[PDB]
């Protein structure tokens, strides 16, 4: 099973993809990045946003 996110765990629940094509993680669990609902438009992760 592939792992994802800042937390390095398997996919679960809703996930969000980072819009930096060079992102090293790519997919994140909503709660790990402080989200309850889908943001509109492009989104970048905390490592990409700084």
């Amino acid at each position: 099973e592939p792992t994802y996110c800042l937390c390095h765990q398997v996919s679960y629940g809703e996930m969000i993809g980072c819009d930096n094509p060079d992102c090293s993680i790519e997919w994140f669990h909503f709660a790990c990045v402080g989200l309850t609902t889908k943001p509109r438009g492009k989104w970048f992760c905390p490592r990409c946003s700084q």
Binding site: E14, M15, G17, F30, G41
Partner: peptide
């Protein structure tokens, strides 16, 4: 944003 359900 792009999202998926597991």
């Amino acid at each position: 944003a792009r999202t998926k359900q597991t």
